[PDB]
Design a protein around this ligand. Structure first.
Ligand SMILES: CCCCCCCCCCCCCCCCCC(=O)OC[C@H](COP(=O)([O-])OCC(O)COP(=O)([O-])OC[C@@H](COC(=O)CCCCCCCCCCCCCCCCC)OC(=O)CCCCCCCCCCCCCCCCC)OC(=O)CCCCCCCCCCCCCCCCC
Ligand SMILES: CCCCCCCCCCCCCCCCCC(=O)OC[C@H](COP(=O)([O-])OCC(O)COP(=O)([O-])OC[C@@H](COC(=O)CCCCCCCCCCCCCCCCC)OC(=O)CCCCCCCCCCCCCCCCC)OC(=O)CCCCCCCCCCCCCCCCC
Ligand SMILES: CCCCCCCCCCCCCCCCCC(=O)OC[C@H](COP(=O)([O-])OCC(O)COP(=O)([O-])OC[C@@H](COC(=O)CCCCCCCCCCCCCCCCC)OC(=O)CCCCCCCCCCCCCCCCC)OC(=O)CCCCCCCCCCCCCCCCC
Ligand SMILES: CCCCCCCCCCCCCCCCCC(=O)OC[C@H](COP(=O)([O-])OCC(O)COP(=O)([O-])OC[C@@H](COC(=O)CCCCCCCCCCCCCCCCC)OC(=O)CCCCCCCCCCCCCCCCC)OC(=O)CCCCCCCCCCCCCCCCC
Ligand SMILES: CCCCCCCCCCCCCCCCCC(=O)OC[C@H](COP(=O)([O-])OCC(O)COP(=O)([O-])OC[C@@H](COC(=O)CCCCCCCCCCCCCCCCC)OC(=O)CCCCCCCCCCCCCCCCC)OC(=O)CCCCCCCCCCCCCCCCC
Ligand code: HEA
Ligand SMILES: CCCCCCCCCCCCCCCCCC(=O)OC[C@H](COP(=O)([O-])OCC[N+](C)(C)C)OC(=O)CCCCCCCCCCCCCCCCC
Lengths: 51, 66, 52, 57, 57, 51, 346, 207, 57
């Protein structure tokens, strides 16, 4: 808190599952990269299922 | 045979002591251990540089040498 | 029926026992009454005569 | 069998580590950070060099 | 240590007079006066100058 | 956002927060600071370069 | 002394620690009367429902062996109406209700009371999970043992009652009901007639109690993130947990009930010594060491599952509803949970 | 040298291990050369020939019960024989290897109480360390008790000061705000009594 | 070891015996897992004992 400007950045709850905050560019880039990294497995995943 | 038997008996007893003390008797270090030390003659005689089992009889000290 | 009394004291308490009682003056340092401390130190040592 | 004993030792050290980290406030070592660091170092060293290496090799 | 008759023939150090002889305990996480701030370890990866100095370990 | 005059005992409020404060499972890191508290802040500007 | 042993009670000076809220702290509602009342209530309700289920299922099977199974829903309703109309069904309902009362007030109620008495004081972490659940393994185990033989006399009295029912007129005791048989057996065939060679029942009760209670408590604590972190119904989650625990208890309890079939029902080889020597414990050990686990699971659902599983499921549900699985969770930093408040907020 | 007390038939007090019914490790030769397996027929598949017999149908589901064949029991050691055979007459026995294969050092099983000790090894080791060595300290594993009223001193346990703080204007208002939990104990006579909902044991008596 | 991944994503340093309040949850779960592992270890030793009551070839 800096006046009514809430400079706080984390707001990280207990049982947090991901990054502490997404207000920085590096962490936004990492989050997008991780999501799309998990996107590109479908065929391989499906393949193993049948095996 | 004297040397052989001395070596073997000492080895077995000291090994048993090591195992038992380091597995069962570490709750009170003061009870199951003694603090000993001896330093160089150049330095003043150490606080723990005394003969054990005679702490209530003697105070051991020595003159420094160089 | 004499004993090694420090050895007996070590026998009675197995290291981590809770036996600090108010009824026992010798149980702990806090429970030793101050009157005994004053009384046991009332006398004085003799001053030697350096006749040598 | 020696590796069984040493693995139990390492499991006990890991149990100490996890009991210290169960909740904040140091419930196990009760504010003694150096003892916790010693436990962590001993756990790592005897798990690497005196459990897995003995067992396998 | 009041009676020398028992002390003179006992083949042990005088630490029995100092080992847990008081009831005064203090259970506060912040009052832990450890053995010494330098009696620690630097993890299973010996990191310097933390590991290689008596001033710190 | 007014520095009003307190009708309470500020020491008592401090000691009651110290003794027994309400907490919950999903409490944010903003409202639960126990190891991350300091007496000074490093203030830097934003959108600019600092070596 | 009063005999060869003296119970030397001693006085000790006080001790205290930094934290007070994650060890054994006996709950105020863990009195003997309250535990007995709650356990008896849950047990009698669950047992009544289970025994009505068993009577209905077995009388439907009895009618289906003489009439064709229904083809559609209207025929199913007619079949069920005729099952309810059966004379054999009403007496079964009455006698199995008496049996349910006996086994709820003295077996399931005793299990619940003993489990609560031994496990009431295990507190849980405030905003985490009870990490040290191993402490409950001996405790729960003890309860199971202490309540293993509490159903044996009642089960053997029921067996004797039906066996009396199925003999000729001259060889009948004339048991008017289940309670009459239970009251008359110990004074006619002796108390040991209700306990002889009861190892299958005892070990089955042990495994039922331990698996059911331990699994339910463990899952209802460890799977609590399912409705605390990611918000779910918690009632569907509790029902799923109870079903999993009941299935595991039934799986771990059935193989010991096959020893009856193996010992005195499997045909014997003429001129050869009887295997297992008619012991049920040599048979239990052979089952324990048998290589094929499917051989002693045949008839799991035909003989055992639908006669114990609904009862165990309702026992878990009603015990959780009444409060025999509730544990105290207190903040470990503020208030009574801490003795060093100065590090709580720094 | 026949002792009927050692005979399982005459001596009825010798309990039979039914899992070792067909196996007698006393009669095991080393190396083992017995043949206890051969072709088995007339259980479900008859040894007769009915392949073309139109008047005969084979129903293997009518299989008759036979004597159960237990899994082979491992050999049990003979203490005297094993000690005698592996004994070496130092300084008067040549250091060589016998031509016969019966000189092989065969492993035979033995007692089981040692493995009873082994089975409880994790329990015993953890108990030893934590309880016997009293790690991390004496008070950790003990049932938790709060200190008595103002024990050891009001600087550490300021129970009366907190009791007054909760019972004053500022304390009542702070409890009203909802950010402070209610007082968890009452000072009755000179005793601090914790409420039932506090979820803690009562303090120990100062003996 | 999955909640440890969760804590690592949230910024939890390695060798600290005290941590911010917002980690305790997963840490508790992690500790729970360890004890589960310990139970498995028990069963391991049990089977060895159970392997010598059995005494089969
Ligand atoms: C020691 C405590 C821990 C034991 C752990 C299990 C290991 C011991 C064991 O298996 O003993 C076998 C032992 C007898 O083995 P056995 O010689 O092969 O005979 C087999 C018969 O089926 C056994 O049937 P039985 O007829 O020989 O004995 C049944 C027993 C009925 O059992 C009991 O009464 C209680 C037995 C368990 C007590 C548990 C603690 C309470 O009845 C009696 O002993 C007679 C009681 C006197 C007459 C009635 C008196 C009351 C009315 C007046 O079994 C019992 O005594 C009953 C079962 C108890 C053990 C299993 C418990 C569950 C599994 C635990 C793992
Ligand atoms: C929480 C997380 C846990 C994680 C664990 C680890 C996960 C990975 C490994 C999987 C482990 C699964 C867990 C074990 C399952 C059970 C093991 C087993 O063999 O079960 C079947 C077994 C019966 O089969 P059997 O006896 O072996 O065979 C003769 C029978 O006549 C039956 O004759 P049959 O020939 O008709 O049946 C053979 C039997 C055979 O049993 C099994 O196969 C069991 C295991 C099935 C699951 C395998 C999952 C593999 C996952 C791979 C993932 C990718 C990598 O099959 C079945 O029963 C049904 C079919 C099962 C599937 C068959 C194929 C399996 C492999 C599939 C994947 C392979 C390719 C992967 C390719 C990957 C490429 C990247 O036992 C039972 O059904 C009941 C067990 C007895 C219970 C008695 C309880 C008495 C009370 C005392 C309890 C103990 C004391 C403590 C009491 C207190 C407790 C609180
Ligand atoms: C060391 C020990 C280690 C143990 C590790 C764990 C081992 C687990 C299995 C051990 C035993 C295996 C052998 C065995 O069971 O033999 C009996 C039985 C043979 O007995 P039987 O004499 O043939 O039965 C005579 C019957 O006439 C004919 O019966 P059947 O041949 O058709 O078989 C029936 C079976 C057939 O089922 C299946 O085959 C299921 C599909 C299995 C697919 C294969 C596995 C895929 C797994 C994928 C993931 C892992 C990889 O039905 C079930 O399994 C149904 C179970 C229902 C449980 C319900 C529990 C709650 C009760 C209350 C319900 C109501 C709640 C709400 C009330 C509200 C009131 C207001 O086994 C089988 O036939 C199946 C073999 C095993 C299949 C998979 C077993 C696991 C599936 C569990 C499902 C339920 C989970 C809990 C649900 C809770 C919902 C609330
Ligand atoms: C910090 C670690 C430090 C390690 C070094 C420190 C010094 C050693 C301390 C630990 C001493 C016990 C170690 C036992 C395991 C290692 C030896 C081994 O595997 O022997 C294989 C040998 C094979 O026996 P088997 O396959 O059952 O049948 C062979 C027949 O007995 C027929 O074969 P046999 O004719 O050769 O039979 C002679 C003898 C069998 O000979 C032995 O049992 C030799 C035992 C001394 C081994 C010395 C070498 C050092 C091994 C250290 C291994 C690490 C420690 C493991 C244990 C930690 C907890 C104590 O059996 C008997 O006399 C029957 C009663 C034996 C009672 C138990 C042993 C005394 O014995 C065992 O496997 C049984 C012991 C298994 C472990 C559980 C019991 C541990 C001791 C409990 C307290 C006893 C008092
Ligand atoms: C309490 C629960 C007991 C459960 C149990 O297994 O009871 C049966 C068990 C008898 O089974 P076992 O251990 O196979 O004894 C059969 C004889 O060893 C059969 O005689 P043996 O020809 O096998 O002679 C071997 C004998 C002689 O071996 C030795 O004396 C080994 C030490 C030699 C030092 C040089 O070793 C023992 O008697 C066992 C020593 C275990 C040391 C740990 O009961 C007891 O041994 C009762 C006393 C010990 C309870 C632990
Ligand atoms: C061999 C590798 C190994 C093993 C097995 C383990 C076991 C475990 N470790 Fe360990 N750990 C390390 C390697 C290992 N660790 C290393 C290298 C470090 C770094 C130290 C440092 O940071 O400097 C570390 C540190 C470390 C920490 C760091 C603490 C801190 O940073 O604050 C933590 C905390 O979560 C942890 C957790 C655990 C847990 C819960 C287990 C549990 O899984 C324990 C499970 C127990 C068993 C696996 C026992 C095996 C069973 C047997 C009885 C063996 C005998 C059987 C036969 C003979 C077949 N470990
Ligand atoms: C000369 C021979 C000496 C041999 C060594 C000494 C004896 C060793 C044998 C001990 C046998 C077991 C006795 C258990 C009695 C428990 C009674 C009780 O309620 O205790 C409460 C204690 C404490 O429960 P708690 O959770 O309330 O306490 C935690 C601490 N406070 C109070 C701060 C919250 O429970 C246990 O210790 C669990 C016992 C479970 C059974 C296993 C015992 C051995 C392992 C104990 C260490 C912990 C790890 C467990 C998991 C791993 C196991 C391999």
């Amino acid at each position: 808190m800096w006046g009514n400007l809430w400079t706080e950045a984390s707001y990280q709850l207990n049982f947090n599952i991901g990054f502490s905050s997404l207000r920085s560019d590096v962490l936004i880039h990492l989050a997008q990269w991780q999501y799309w990294w998990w996107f590109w497995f479908a065929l391989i995943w499906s393949f193993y299922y049948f095996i | 045979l004297s040397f052989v038997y001395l070596s073997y008996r000492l080895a077995w007893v000291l090994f048993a002591y090591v195992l038992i003390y380091n597995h069962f008797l570490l709750g009170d270090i003061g009870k199951t251990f003694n603090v000993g030390e001896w330093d160089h003659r150049l330095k003043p005689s150490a606080e723990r540089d005394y003969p054990t089992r005679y702490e209530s009889l003697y105070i051991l000290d020595r003159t420094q040498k160089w | 029926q004499e004993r090694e009394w420090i050895f007996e004291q070590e026998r009675q308490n197995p290291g981590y026992g809770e036996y600090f009682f108010k009824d026992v003056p010798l149980s702990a340092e806090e429970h030793f009454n101050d009157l005994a401390r004053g009384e046991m130190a009332k006398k004085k040592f003799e001053k030697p005569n350096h006749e040598f | 069998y020696f590796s069984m004993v040493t693995g139990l030792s390492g499991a006990a050290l890991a149990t100490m580590i996890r009991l210290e980290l169960a909740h904040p406030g140091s419930p196990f070592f009760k504010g003694d950070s150096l003892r916790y660091l010693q436990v962590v170092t001993a756990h790592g060293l005897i798990m690497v060099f005196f459990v897995v290496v003995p067992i396998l090799f | 240590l009041m009676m020398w008759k028992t002390m003179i023939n006992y083949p042990e150090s005088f630490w029995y007079a100092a080992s847990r002889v008081v009831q005064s305990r203090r259970k506060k996480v912040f009052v832990t006066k450890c053995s010494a701030r330098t009696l620690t370890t630097a993890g299973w990866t010996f990191i310097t100058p933390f590991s290689s100095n008596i001033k710190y370990t | 956002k007014l520095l009003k005059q307190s009708i309470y005992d500020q020491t008592t409020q401090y000691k009651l927060i110290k003794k027994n404060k309400k907490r919950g499972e999903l409490i944010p890191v903003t409202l639960a600071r126990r190891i991350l508290r300091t007496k000074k802040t490093l203030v830097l500007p934003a959108h600019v370069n600092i070596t | 002394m009063f005999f060869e042993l003296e119970d030397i009670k001693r006085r000790h000076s006080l001790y205290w620690d930094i934290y007070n809220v994650q060890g054994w702290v006996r709950r105020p509602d863990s009195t003997l009367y309250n535990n007995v009342k709650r356990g008896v209530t849950a047990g009698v309700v669950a047992s009544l429902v289970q025994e009505n289920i068993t009577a209905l299922v077995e009388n439907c099977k009895l009618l289906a062996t003489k009439y064709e199974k229904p083809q559609n829903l209207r025929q199913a309703a007619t079949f069920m109406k005729e099952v309810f109309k059966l004379e054999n069904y009403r007496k079964a309902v009455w006698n199995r209700s008496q049996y349910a009362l006996c086994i709820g007030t003295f077996d399931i109620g005793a299990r619940l009371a003993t489990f609560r008495w031994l496990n009431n004081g295990w507190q849980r972490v405030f905003a985490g999970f009870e990490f040290n659940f191993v402490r409950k393994i001996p405790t729960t185990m003890l309860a199971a043992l202490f309540t293993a033989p509490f159903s044996v006399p009642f089960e053997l009295a029921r067996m004797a009652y039906y066996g009396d029912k199925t003999f000729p007129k001259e060889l009948q005791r004339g048991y008017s009901s289940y309670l009459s048989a239970l009251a008359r057996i110990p004074f006619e065939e002796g108390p040991y007639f209700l306990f002889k060679n009861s190892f299958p029942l005892i070990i089955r009760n042990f495994f039922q109690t331990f698996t059911l209670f331990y699994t339910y408590d463990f899952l209802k604590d460890k799977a609590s993130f399912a409705w605390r972190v990611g918000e779910q119904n918690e009632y569907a989650c509790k029902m799923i947990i109870a079903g999993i625990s009941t299935y595991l208890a039934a799986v771990f309890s059935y193989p010991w009930m096959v020893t009856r079939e193996m010992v005195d029902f499997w045909p014997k080889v003429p001129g050869a010594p009887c295997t297992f020597n008619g012991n049920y414990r040599k048979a239990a050990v052979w089952i324990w060491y048998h290589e094929f686990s499917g051989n002693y699971f045949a008839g799991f659902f035909t003989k055992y599952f639908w006669k114990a599983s609904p009862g165990m499921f309702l026992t878990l549900m009603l015990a959780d509803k009444v409060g025999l699985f509730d544990q105290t969770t207190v903040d470990n930093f503020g208030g009574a949970g801490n003795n060093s408040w100065e590090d709580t907020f720094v | 040298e026949y002792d009927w007390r050692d005979d399982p038939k005459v001596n009825k007090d010798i309990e039979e291990d039914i899992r070792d019914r067909g196996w007698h490790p006393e009669t095991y030769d080393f190396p083992y050369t017995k043949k206890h397996d051969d072709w088995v027929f007339d259980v479900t598949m008859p040894s007769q020939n009915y392949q073309t017999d139109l008047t005969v149908n084979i129903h293997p589901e009518n299989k008759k019960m036979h004597v159960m064949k237990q899994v082979m029991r491992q050999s049990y050691w003979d203490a005297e024989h094993d000690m005698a055979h592996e004994y070496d007459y130092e300084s008067e026995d040549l250091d060589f290897q016998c031509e016969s294969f019966k000189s092989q050092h065969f492993r035979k099983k033995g007692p089981i109480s040692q493995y009873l000790i082994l089975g409880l090894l994790p329990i015993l080791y953890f108990g030893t360390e934590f309880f016997y060595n009293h790690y991390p300290d004496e008070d950790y594993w003990r049932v938790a008790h709060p200190p008595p009223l103002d024990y050891p001193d009001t600087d550490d346990t300021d129970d009366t000061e907190t009791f007054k703080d909760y019972k004053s204007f500022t304390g009542r208002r702070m409890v009203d705000t909802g950010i402070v939990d209610p007082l968890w104990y009452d000072i009755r006579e000179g005793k601090k009594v914790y409420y039932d909902w506090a979820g803690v044991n009562q303090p120990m008596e100062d003996i | 070891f999955v909640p440890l991944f969760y804590l690592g994503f949230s910024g939890m340093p390695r060798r600290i015996h005290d941590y911010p309040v917002v980690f305790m949850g997963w840490h508790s779960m992690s500790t729970t897992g360890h004890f589960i592992t310990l139970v498995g270890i028990i069963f391991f030793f049990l089977m060895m004992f159970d392997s010598h009551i059995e005494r089969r070839a």
